[PDB]
Amino acid sequence: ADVAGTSNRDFRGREQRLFNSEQYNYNNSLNGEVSVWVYAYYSDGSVLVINKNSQYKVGISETFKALKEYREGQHNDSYDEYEVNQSIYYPNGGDARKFHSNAKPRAIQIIFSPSVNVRTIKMAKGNAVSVPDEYLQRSHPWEATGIKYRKIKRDGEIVGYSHYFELPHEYNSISLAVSGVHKNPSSYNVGSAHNVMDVFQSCDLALRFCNRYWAELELVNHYISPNAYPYLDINNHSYGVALSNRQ
Amino acid sequence: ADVAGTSNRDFRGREQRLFNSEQYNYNNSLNGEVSVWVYAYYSDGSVLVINKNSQYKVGISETFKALKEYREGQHNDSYDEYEVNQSIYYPNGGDARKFHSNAKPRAIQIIFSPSVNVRTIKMAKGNAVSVPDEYLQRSHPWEATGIKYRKIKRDGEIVGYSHYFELPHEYNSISLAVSGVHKNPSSYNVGSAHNVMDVFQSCDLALRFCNRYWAELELVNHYISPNAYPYLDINNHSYGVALSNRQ
Amino acid sequence: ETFKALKEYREGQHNDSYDEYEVNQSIYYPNGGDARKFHSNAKPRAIQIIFSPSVNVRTIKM
Amino acid sequence: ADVAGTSNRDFRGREQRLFNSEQYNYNNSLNGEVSVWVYAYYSDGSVLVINKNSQYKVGISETFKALKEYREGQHNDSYDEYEVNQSIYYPNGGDARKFHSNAKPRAIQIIFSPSVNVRTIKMAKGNAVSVPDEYLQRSHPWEATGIKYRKIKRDGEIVGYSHYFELPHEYNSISLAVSGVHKNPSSYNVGSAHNVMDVFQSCDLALRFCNRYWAELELVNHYISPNAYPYLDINNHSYGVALSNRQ
Ligand SMILES: Nc1ncnc2c1ncn2[C@@H]1O[C@H](COP(=O)(O)OP(=O)(O)OP(=O)(O)O)[C@@H](O)[C@H]1O
Ligand SMILES: Nc1ncnc2c1ncn2[C@@H]1O[C@H](COP(=O)(O)OP(=O)(O)OP(=O)(O)O)[C@@H](O)[C@H]1O
Ligand SMILES: Nc1ncnc2c1ncn2[C@@H]1O[C@H](COP(=O)(O)OP(=O)(O)OP(=O)(O)O)[C@@H](O)[C@H]1O
Ligand SMILES: Nc1ccn([C@@H]2O[C@H](COP(=O)(O)OP(=O)(O)OP(=O)(O)O)[C@@H](O)[C@H]2O)c(=O)n1
Ligand SMILES: Nc1ccn([C@@H]2O[C@H](COP(=O)(O)OP(=O)(O)OP(=O)(O)O)[C@@H](O)[C@H]2O)c(=O)n1
Ligand SMILES: Nc1ccn([C@@H]2O[C@H](COP(=O)(O)OP(=O)(O)OP(=O)(O)O)[C@@H](O)[C@H]2O)c(=O)n1
Ligand SMILES: Nc1ccn([C@@H]2O[C@H](COP(=O)(O)OP(=O)(O)OP(=O)(O)O)[C@@H](O)[C@H]2O)c(=O)n1
Ligand SMILES: [Cl-]
Ligand SMILES: [Cl-]
Ligand SMILES: [Cl-]
Ligand SMILES: [Mg+2]
Ligand SMILES: [Mg+2]
Ligand SMILES: [Mg+2]
Ligand SMILES: [Mg+2]
């Protein structure tokens, strides 16, 4: 045989680069996944992740209550936290024994897979009673926030898209839903009559994941990295795997 | 300037009436919200509210178990209540230490925003095992109940629609789903191919809210009124805000 | 005051007292403890020291 | 440049030796710390450390009750231990369900920094009701125990002073206070009128530390060693860092 890494007859090398390009391009096909993650960051350094993975389009919708920190199998001040909610829904509406619940998220990061079309991203960042914009009567049900998404890059390749906003103020009490559509550069509408029932099925077939990790380190080590997911950490470092035309 | 309230040059007054009419009419546009609430009334006077707000259409679907009273951070007879469920799913199926669970709703009120089209409202009021009509084989999956909805009115204006039914009998054990579609007097189908993917996104973007309030008074004071929501109380009094062509 | 003494203590409520022992061990020496949190919410976020106007400011020591 | 370690022009080496000598000599100046530690050794192998660090002079004073083992966030037989105390304060004074409390220290080690003057060390080793010598009327309030302190040495340098006494007998129930004064070879009295108010301030500025470590190993690894503290272990091994005229 030829010697490795010296000619066009390194079929091992050619197949390695094709294997990776195929993964990159499959994900971008209409047969591929589009994925979203919501990360809610708590003052104790823990992070709630909610992930959903689906064909065609994908989204996550959570209440104020659902985004609050919950420590499985430990005490959570559950009665006092009921009272916290009452005071967040209406000023002076509760009888809580704290000014600020440490269960409230300090920040949110929304990441989409690179298979999303950024121009299709929509977000409804509502108040604590789940109203998008002050009162229902004056609410557009979403904002198209795509222009705010930063490209998460590794080796020059976009491995995902991130929108990050902090909630550092006492009045930052939110409900949250986000949605994006899989890229489709073709003129075949995946929701046209020929394929619409398959999009209805994708809504049922979408796989969801949620877990609270104890630290961003643990999230990077045990969630992001093992699964080849994109991520952007507090220090603005990008994680993910470049695949297009790469060994 | 002219004197206030004496001529057509009271631009403050004209803008006030326009501000309110715009809110009313925006809500009724295809860009606007449609909203539904389910209120489940318990014998201790408390009220579970489930709200969902979304573009195009909206609905809520709950199990028998999910509609039962749950007191956050307090005792709920949770083991006995497991046994209650077993006896509700099949007669004599459980080993409960009570004849009647006080966690079962005594009544349900369904309210839609005035942006719904009443003729599109559908409800699936199922038995405790989530069958619409006795056995699946003979079940139409919904009833169109719009003719039963009463107009909630303030100052002559429809501020919402209410369907109320009591569950006062031992055999009134239900699962419940309800759905309505946003008004659309145009011949532009929001679910036609041009916009169908946006309706799929609206399903993900819909914002949900749920909370148990201790009394109808607390619900009227701290939920309905602050948010300019429509409501109909036990005494048949209407709440909400008239906005069309009003200061 | 000690590090331990300045940490939040909620009289008559739960304080994660065992976990907080472990937090202290990890604060005294890196990786010295076995705590189930990265950041204890009991740690002060700020300190304000106020003296009466009867102090001589040039004598203040910390 | 000259070659490293071959001439008087190794300024890196000269500065390294000066850096260490300066630390040694600063500590011995009147501007420097004097420090004391009390280690109370329990039968479960755990060790309570109490440390105080201050200018001019330093001391620690503890009750019988305060020197007993306390396991943070675990059970401590707290009611029975109240009864133990009553029986230690006066024979047959309590109603305890044990003959010997395993919370009682088996030994005490007192260590001073090498900045103390050993001739100034004073100790009040009282009975369980905090009387130095049987009855108050006949009690000198302290013993000058300096002659009993062993030099803890590393590389020929005194890194601290240790007095160790075991409490292996049923009747060894003590209260304990110890005090030492910072070296002052000068004829400037730090407590004379010129500086007395600064010594009063040092009493308030003194920093204290206390913690229970699970084993002498853990104490040596995570308390003594990281902080360059002197120590003498059960096997008579010395720990600390020699600094005078050393790289
Ligand atoms: N929407 C897209 N989806 C996937 N890949 C893209 C997209 N737009 C550009 N690329 C490709 O990704 C790589 C990086 O291009 P990009 O324009 O993001 O980088 P840049 O111009 O250096 O940075 P930026 O545009 O963020 O200032 C290029 O190979 C480019 O062809
Ligand atoms: N589907 C609708 N959506 C919004 N507004 C409506 C609708 N139908 C009528 N209206 C308007 O609402 C106001 C009240 O009309 P409505 O017919 O409800 O009252 P009514 O005839 O006095 O009472 P009812 O018809 O309930 O006996 C009128 O201004 C009317 O033009
Ligand atoms: N009070 C002191 N404080 C600090 N250093 C001292 C003191 N006394 C002596 N030294 C110095 O410490 C080093 C060790 O002296 P030291 O006399 O302690 O040892 P030794 O005579 O071998 O042992 P020992 O005297 O304990 O039998 C010498 O450099 C000495 O000059
Ligand atoms: N505003 C509050 C907060 C707490 N409590 C009381 O304190 C007890 C414990 O408080 P809780 O909020 O439930 O905290 P934990 O029990 O410690 O945590 P968890 O319920 O999550 O296990 C409750 O039984 C409740 O009676 C109260 O009276 N009113
Ligand atoms: N039909 C029943 C009802 C109750 N129990 C027992 O009674 C105990 C307490 O009852 P539970 O139904 O769980 O009520 P609470 O503990 O008071 O309320 P909660 O669980 O919601 O805190 C349970 O441990 C269960 O063993 C039982 O044996 N069989
Ligand atoms: N790092 C930790 C933290 C907690 N626990 C266990 O969890 C239980 C409860 O945790 P704790 O820290 O003591 O919190 P609370 O009991 O809820 O609060 P408090 O002790 O202040 O009343 C303890 O008995 C302990 O066994 C543990 O195994 N290790
Ligand atoms: N001489 C004693 C010892 C114990 N008790 C009883 O035993 C119970 C538990 O004993 P305690 O000494 O308090 O040990 P723990 O509860 O296990 O530990 P802790 O209190 O430190 O959590 C107490 O409520 C007390 O009523 C008693 O009657 N008389
Ligand atoms: Cl394709
Ligand atoms: Cl429109
Ligand atoms: Cl000096
Ligand atoms: Mg509780
Ligand atoms: Mg129970
Ligand atoms: Mg505990
Ligand atoms: Mg006890």
CSV table of N, CA, C and O in Angstrom, one decimal, chain C residues 1-4 17-18 20-22 24-25 28-33 59-62, chain D residues 72-74 198 201 205-214 218 221-223 226-227:
chain,number,residue,atom,x,y,z
C,1,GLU,N,-15.2,38.5,64.3
C,1,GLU,CA,-16.0,37.3,63.9
C,1,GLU,C,-15.2,36.4,62.9
C,1,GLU,O,-14.4,36.8,62.1
C,2,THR,N,-15.5,35.1,63.1
C,2,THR,CA,-15.0,34.0,62.2
C,2,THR,C,-15.7,34.0,60.9
C,2,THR,O,-16.8,34.6,60.8
C,3,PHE,N,-15.1,33.4,59.9
C,3,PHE,CA,-15.8,33.0,58.7
C,3,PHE,C,-17.2,32.4,58.9
C,3,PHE,O,-18.2,32.8,58.4
C,4,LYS,N,-17.2,31.4,59.8
C,4,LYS,CA,-18.3,30.6,60.1
C,4,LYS,C,-19.4,31.5,60.7
C,4,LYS,O,-20.6,31.4,60.3
C,17,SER,N,-27.4,22.4,57.9
C,17,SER,CA,-26.3,22.4,58.8
C,17,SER,C,-25.1,21.4,58.6
C,17,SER,O,-23.9,21.7,58.6
C,18,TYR,N,-25.5,20.2,58.2
C,18,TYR,CA,-24.5,19.2,57.8
C,18,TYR,C,-23.8,19.6,56.5
C,18,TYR,O,-22.5,19.7,56.5
C,20,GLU,N,-23.4,22.4,55.3
C,20,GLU,CA,-22.7,23.7,55.6
C,20,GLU,C,-21.4,23.4,56.4
C,20,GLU,O,-20.5,24.2,56.2
C,21,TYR,N,-21.4,22.4,57.2
C,21,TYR,CA,-20.1,21.9,57.8
C,21,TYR,C,-19.2,21.5,56.6
C,21,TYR,O,-18.0,21.9,56.6
C,22,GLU,N,-19.7,20.8,55.6
C,22,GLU,CA,-18.9,20.4,54.5
C,22,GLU,C,-18.4,21.6,53.6
C,22,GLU,O,-17.3,21.6,53.1
C,24,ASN,N,-17.8,24.5,54.8
C,24,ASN,CA,-16.6,25.1,55.5
C,24,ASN,C,-15.3,24.4,55.2
C,24,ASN,O,-14.3,25.0,55.0
C,25,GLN,N,-15.4,23.1,55.2
C,25,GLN,CA,-14.2,22.3,55.0
C,25,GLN,C,-13.6,22.6,53.6
C,25,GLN,O,-12.4,22.7,53.5
C,28,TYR,N,-12.0,26.2,53.8
C,28,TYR,CA,-10.7,26.2,54.6
C,28,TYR,C,-9.6,25.7,53.7
C,28,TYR,O,-8.4,26.2,53.9
C,29,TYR,N,-9.8,24.8,52.9
C,29,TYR,CA,-8.8,24.2,52.0
C,29,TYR,C,-9.5,23.7,50.7
C,29,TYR,O,-10.5,23.1,50.8
C,30,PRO,N,-8.9,24.1,49.5
C,30,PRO,CA,-9.6,23.7,48.3
C,30,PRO,C,-9.8,22.3,48.2
C,30,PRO,O,-8.9,21.5,48.5
C,31,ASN,N,-11.0,21.8,47.8
C,31,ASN,CA,-11.4,20.4,47.7
C,31,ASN,C,-11.3,19.6,49.1
C,31,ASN,O,-11.0,18.4,49.1
C,32,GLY,N,-11.5,20.4,50.2
C,32,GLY,CA,-11.3,19.8,51.5
C,32,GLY,C,-12.6,19.2,52.0
C,32,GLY,O,-12.6,18.5,53.0
C,33,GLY,N,-13.7,19.5,51.3
C,33,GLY,CA,-15.0,19.0,51.8
C,33,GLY,C,-15.7,18.2,50.9
C,33,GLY,O,-15.2,17.9,49.8
C,59,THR,N,-8.1,56.4,64.0
C,59,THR,CA,-7.8,55.2,64.9
C,59,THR,C,-8.4,53.9,64.4
C,59,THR,O,-8.2,52.8,65.0
C,60,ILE,N,-9.3,54.0,63.4
C,60,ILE,CA,-10.0,52.7,62.9
C,60,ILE,C,-9.0,51.8,62.3
C,60,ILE,O,-8.1,52.1,61.6
C,61,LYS,N,-9.1,50.5,62.7
C,61,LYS,CA,-8.3,49.5,62.3
C,61,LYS,C,-9.1,48.3,61.9
C,61,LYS,O,-10.2,48.0,62.6
C,62,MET,N,-8.7,47.5,60.9
C,62,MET,CA,-9.5,46.4,60.4
C,62,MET,C,-8.5,45.2,60.1
C,62,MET,O,-7.5,45.5,59.5
D,72,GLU,N,-21.1,18.9,64.1
D,72,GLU,CA,-22.0,19.8,63.4
D,72,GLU,C,-22.9,19.0,62.4
D,72,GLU,O,-22.4,18.1,61.7
D,73,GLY,N,-24.2,19.3,62.5
D,73,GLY,CA,-25.2,18.6,61.6
D,73,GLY,C,-25.4,17.1,61.9
D,73,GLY,O,-25.9,16.4,61.0
D,74,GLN,N,-24.9,16.6,63.0
D,74,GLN,CA,-25.2,15.2,63.4
D,74,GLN,C,-25.8,15.1,64.8
D,74,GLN,O,-25.8,16.2,65.5
D,198,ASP,N,-3.3,51.0,71.7
D,198,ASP,CA,-3.2,50.0,70.6
D,198,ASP,C,-3.2,48.6,71.1
D,198,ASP,O,-3.7,47.7,70.4
D,201,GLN,N,-6.9,47.9,71.4
D,201,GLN,CA,-7.4,47.6,70.1
D,201,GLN,C,-7.0,46.2,69.6
D,201,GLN,O,-7.9,45.6,69.0
D,205,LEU,N,-9.1,43.2,67.7
D,205,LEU,CA,-8.7,42.9,66.3
D,205,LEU,C,-8.2,41.4,66.1
D,205,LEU,O,-8.0,41.0,65.0
D,206,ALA,N,-8.0,40.8,67.2
D,206,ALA,CA,-7.5,39.4,67.3
D,206,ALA,C,-8.5,38.6,66.4
D,206,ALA,O,-9.7,38.7,66.6
D,207,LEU,N,-8.0,37.7,65.5
D,207,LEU,CA,-8.8,36.8,64.7
D,207,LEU,C,-8.8,35.4,65.3
D,207,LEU,O,-7.8,34.9,65.7
D,208,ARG,N,-10.0,34.8,65.3
D,208,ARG,CA,-10.2,33.5,66.0
D,208,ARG,C,-10.6,32.5,64.9
D,208,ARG,O,-11.3,32.9,63.9
D,209,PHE,N,-10.3,31.2,65.1
D,209,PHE,CA,-10.7,30.1,64.2
D,209,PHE,C,-11.0,28.9,65.1
D,209,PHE,O,-10.3,28.6,66.0
D,210,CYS,N,-12.1,28.2,64.7
D,210,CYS,CA,-12.3,26.9,65.3
D,210,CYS,C,-13.0,25.9,64.4
D,210,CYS,O,-13.8,26.3,63.5
D,211,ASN,N,-12.6,24.7,64.5
D,211,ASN,CA,-13.1,23.7,63.5
D,211,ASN,C,-12.8,22.3,64.1
D,211,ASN,O,-11.8,22.2,64.8
D,212,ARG,N,-13.7,21.3,63.9
D,212,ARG,CA,-13.4,19.9,64.2
D,212,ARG,C,-13.0,19.2,63.0
D,212,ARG,O,-13.8,19.1,62.0
D,213,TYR,N,-11.8,18.7,62.9
D,213,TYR,CA,-11.2,17.8,61.9
D,213,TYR,C,-11.4,16.3,62.2
D,213,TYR,O,-11.4,16.0,63.4
D,214,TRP,N,-11.6,15.5,61.2
D,214,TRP,CA,-12.0,14.1,61.5
D,214,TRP,C,-10.8,13.2,62.0
D,214,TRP,O,-11.0,12.2,62.5
D,218,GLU,N,-6.0,14.5,58.6
D,218,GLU,CA,-6.7,15.6,58.0
D,218,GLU,C,-6.3,17.0,58.5
D,218,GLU,O,-6.2,17.9,57.7
D,221,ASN,N,-2.8,17.5,57.0
D,221,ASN,CA,-2.9,17.8,55.6
D,221,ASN,C,-3.6,19.1,55.2
D,221,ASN,O,-3.2,19.8,54.2
D,222,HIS,N,-4.6,19.4,55.9
D,222,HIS,CA,-5.5,20.5,55.5
D,222,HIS,C,-5.6,21.7,56.4
D,222,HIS,O,-6.2,22.7,56.0
D,223,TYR,N,-5.0,21.6,57.5
D,223,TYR,CA,-4.9,22.8,58.5
D,223,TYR,C,-3.5,23.2,58.7
D,223,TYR,O,-3.1,24.4,58.3
D,226,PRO,N,-1.0,23.5,54.9
D,226,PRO,CA,-1.3,24.6,53.9
D,226,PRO,C,-1.0,26.0,54.5
D,226,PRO,O,-0.8,26.9,53.8
D,227,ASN,N,-1.1,26.1,55.8
D,227,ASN,CA,-1.0,27.4,56.4
D,227,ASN,C,0.4,27.7,57.0
D,227,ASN,O,0.6,28.7,57.7
